[PDB]
UniProtKB/Swiss-Prot annotation, chain A:
It comes from Rattus norvegicus. Ubiquitinated; mediated by STUB1/CHIP in the presence of Hsp70 and Hsp40 (in vitro). This is Nitric oxide synthase 1. Isoform N-NOS-1 is expressed in brain and colorectum. Found in the Auerbach's plexus of the enteric nervous system. Isoform PNNOS is expressed in the penis, urethra, prostate, and skeletal muscle, and coexists with the cerebellar nnos in the pelvic plexus, bladder and liver, and is detectable in the cerebellum. It is found in: Cell membrane, Sarcolemma; Cell projection, Dendritic spine. (6R)-L-erythro-5,6,7,8-tetrahydrobiopterin binds at S36, V370, W371, F384. Produces nitric oxide (NO) which is a messenger molecule with diverse functions throughout the body. In the brain and peripheral nervous system, NO displays many properties of a neurotransmitter. Inhibitory transmitter for non-adrenergic and non-cholinergic nerves in the colorectum. Probably has nitrosylase activity and mediates cysteine S-nitrosylation of cytoplasmic target proteins such SRR. Inhibitory transmitter for non-adrenergic and non-cholinergic nerves in the colorectum. Heme b binds at C108, Y399. L-arginine binds at Q171, W280, Y281, E285. The chain holds residues 299 to 718 of 1429 of the full protein. Homodimer. Interacts with DLG4 (via N-terminal tandem pair of PDZ domains); the interaction possibly being prevented by the association between NOS1 and CAPON. Forms a ternary complex with CAPON and RASD1. Forms a ternary complex with CAPON and SYN1. Interacts with ZDHHC23. Interacts with NOSIP; which may impair its synaptic location. Interacts with HTR4. Interacts with SLC6A4. Interacts with VAC14.
Amino acid sequence: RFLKVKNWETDVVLTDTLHLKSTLETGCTEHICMGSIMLPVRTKDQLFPLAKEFLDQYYSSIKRFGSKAHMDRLEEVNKEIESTSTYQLKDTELIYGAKHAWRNASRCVGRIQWSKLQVFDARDCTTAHGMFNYICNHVKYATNKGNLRSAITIFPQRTDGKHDFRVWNSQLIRYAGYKQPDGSTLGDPANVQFTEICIQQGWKAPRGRFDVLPLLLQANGNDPELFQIPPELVLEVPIRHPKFDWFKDLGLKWYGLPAVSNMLLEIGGLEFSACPFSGWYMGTEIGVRDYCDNSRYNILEEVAKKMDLDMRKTSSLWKDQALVEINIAVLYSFQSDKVTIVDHHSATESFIKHMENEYRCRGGCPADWVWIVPPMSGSITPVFHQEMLNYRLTPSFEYQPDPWNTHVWKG
Amino acid sequence: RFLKVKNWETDVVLTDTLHLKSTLETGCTEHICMGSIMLPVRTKDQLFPLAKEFLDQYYSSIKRFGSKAHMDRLEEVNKEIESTSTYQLKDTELIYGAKHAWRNASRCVGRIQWSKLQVFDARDCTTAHGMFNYICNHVKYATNKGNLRSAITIFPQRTDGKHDFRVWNSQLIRYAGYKQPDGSTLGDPANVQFTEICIQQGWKAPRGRFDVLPLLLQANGNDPELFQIPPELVLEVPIRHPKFDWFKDLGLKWYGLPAVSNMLLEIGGLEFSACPFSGWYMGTEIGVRDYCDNSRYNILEEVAKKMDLDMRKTSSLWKDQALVEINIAVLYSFQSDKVTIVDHHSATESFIKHMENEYRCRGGCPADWVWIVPPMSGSITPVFHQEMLNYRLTPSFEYQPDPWNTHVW
Ligand code: HEM
Ligand code: HEM
Ligand SMILES: Cc1cc(N)nc(C[C@@H]2CNC[C@@H]2OCCNC[C@H](F)c2cccc(F)c2)c1
Ligand SMILES: Cc1cc(N)nc(C[C@@H]2CNC[C@@H]2OCCNC[C@H](F)c2cccc(F)c2)c1
Ligand SMILES: C[C@H](O)[C@H](O)[C@H]1CNc2nc(N)[nH]c(=O)c2N1
Ligand SMILES: C[C@H](O)[C@H](O)[C@H]1CNc2nc(N)[nH]c(=O)c2N1
Ligand SMILES: [Zn+2]
């Protein structure tokens, strides 16, 4: 079965055969589409098929499919599963798996970079202190003094689901948020609940607008532990504007390293519940979402006041004017400090080229249009005009619920 | 089977039950989502269930479900289908049907308006000249000297499908497009093909940049014929900027009346293949899409240059800057000439209100996020943060392929 996608700007038509390798469900049925819904313990029985499917993919990719090395590895895994109920990935397999999970991540606009990913194998980690050290090294390697390098650090897999490794932080680097008694928030309203957990865990909060949060790390199903990332490891960029000199006096800054730490990595049926990963920012992430979302730093009004825009009617497009200036500022600031960043025009153009390459060499590229299209200037980016098929390949990254809702506190 | 939608900005969660009445298929499966794909006669016994499903929802709406008068109409329609192979809607049923097709239109951000729709019943029409008359009357009514009113004009229903009424134009009012010896395109590059079909049929093109196209109208499955809309019925707006004096020098204008004319209206299993409808513009349609799309008028480069912005690197956001100014100019010009227009902020805020009314009054509101989120400044509009469920309810508007592909002459 063949599915076609058209680009409405170019009239380029692509053929997808890769969707035929899709296993998991989308959330959609032929009666309902859930494309804009954000969120639409395994047996040996379910595990060997999954291991086999993975090892089969790995071995075809190295062109060893059917080899003796191939057949011996199947049998080896087969026997490990029957005897220990699970199995361990070889290093080569883990690397290929982590890369492919990124490749398969349909909400990620940055995937042209997928084959360049530094994998750190932290499967020998046993404690939170060990996790802390591993994550420091990741941040230092990835930051590279502003010349950012993609990386992922992989902690031990789920066993009985009672001994999970987890990073409680949703990103390794983020700013505290403090709900004030007057109902206003200080710092990042997205992080209020987590900040409150940190405090109750004994964090001494500075109570400023940009306090870097402490890591909260769970090893082996244990209660999580607080660690402060060394400040000298946390690269930050004060935000200023090339034309407007009052921009700097808004007091804004952001961290250079976007590092997702709450996702679950699945390779060959195995589940890595702690697999923090990082690349670099696309500017709209900070300038549109982090700064201008109403429920985030929400700076639109203050920027527009300073700009003396006509604010009495939405139809002056004052919000849109201030939005563009803030985004110019973010890109200018990162560039001036030599911290890696990509603008949304460049990133989407690169994604379209990646997407076409993948169709030619792989028979497809699952993509989620809802997330790929930047949150400003959508239709002046080529991804707006590009039809996409969204489906699920493994290896994969999955959202998992925040651990404070699930953790069995040991005390 | 009962589904929740969350707004991530506000935390308001709504429960959808309306989807369990959905009938048509989406294109999505459990394995593949086609949410971003633009494009994902009836026999006697196909038509009766369709009529019944409609008449049931109609009688329920006027709170006479299961009433003597309900059962009597179901009977009358049954008799009429068995004997005539189709049936005729009562005026009341047609009006309700059309308002509901709009209400069910999951791609449409302006549905807060769905109940205020003037329906022109053109089912007595029989020639193309008649179609032209009807359409000028629609154009003049809806335009209302710039105080726009929503309207639809419904021509006769499909029969054996060898006698369709069709408006060949995709919209009642649009601009011609011609390829040049130089190789670029003059006017709207999206209408090049249609403009060639008009000249083929005898239109003498002014051969300018903003030439209102003629109507090509098809009555009763006949070869289509050409008519010019009276120039004085086409309200156009010169585009200027409130601060950039040079903007007017681009020589840009756009028409005030957006009027879609290639859709198929399906009510109670009957198919109205010529049903032009019109409301009023959200500014982004013109300013973002019509003017800035690369394969449309594609004017970004020229505006950016007149603004003296840094066009050397994508990261200066020159495109983004120019885009906003173009959209300020559309909105300002329409407002100055007192022609109804809505900005994307106000439109999307009204739609959130509409969603909330529909969830509580009707149990849901089908909505296609990919179309509903404006093509600029997406996440500063409230619809970006609103989860939506997309499903197909009937009565409905459905896209039709361009008829020059169908028709034989
Ligand atoms: C190297 C530069 C990269 C860029 C510019 C980039 C860009 C992005 C952006 C803009 C998003 C949407 C983010 C959001 O809106 O919250 C995203 C999502 C995502 N990316 Fe990337 N990405 C990069 C690297 C990576 C890496 C290194 C990985 C994994 C190894 C990754 C995996 C993911 C996943 C799993 C998502 C979905 C996240 C979620 O569901 O919350 N990306 N990417
Ligand atoms: C009253 C002012 C109205 C506003 C502001 C409005 C707004 C819009 C917008 C922005 C779109 C997306 C159009 C595009 O991107 O091409 C749209 C689509 C649509 N609307 Fe409306 N609308 C209005 C009136 C109407 C009326 C009166 C009807 C039917 C009687 C209607 C039915 C539809 C349908 C069927 C679509 C999808 C069309 C397609 O598939 O091309 N709308 N609406
Ligand atoms: C509910 C829910 C589900 C889901 N899958 N995900 C979320 C995180 C949201 C997505 N939108 C904001 C926030 O996630 C913010 C973090 N995203 C950073 C991005 F993925 C990125 C960029 C560059 C490099 C890199 F490694 C990573 C929430
Ligand atoms: C391939 C295809 C499928 C489909 N359903 N539709 C199309 C028309 C495209 C969609 N997007 C731009 C263009 O259609 C432009 C016409 N849109 C006008 C809009 F619906 C509107 C606004 C305000 C009032 C009103 F009555 C109508 C093409
Ligand atoms: C409801 C909707 O799915 C939600 O707001 C999505 C829309 N698109 C997005 N796109 C990206 N990249 N990141 C997001 O958080 C979201 N949020
Ligand atoms: C491929 C994608 O579906 C296509 O470009 C859509 C995206 N969203 C849209 N949204 C609206 N309102 N109108 C459109 O024409 C489109 N085009
Ligand atoms: Zn879908």
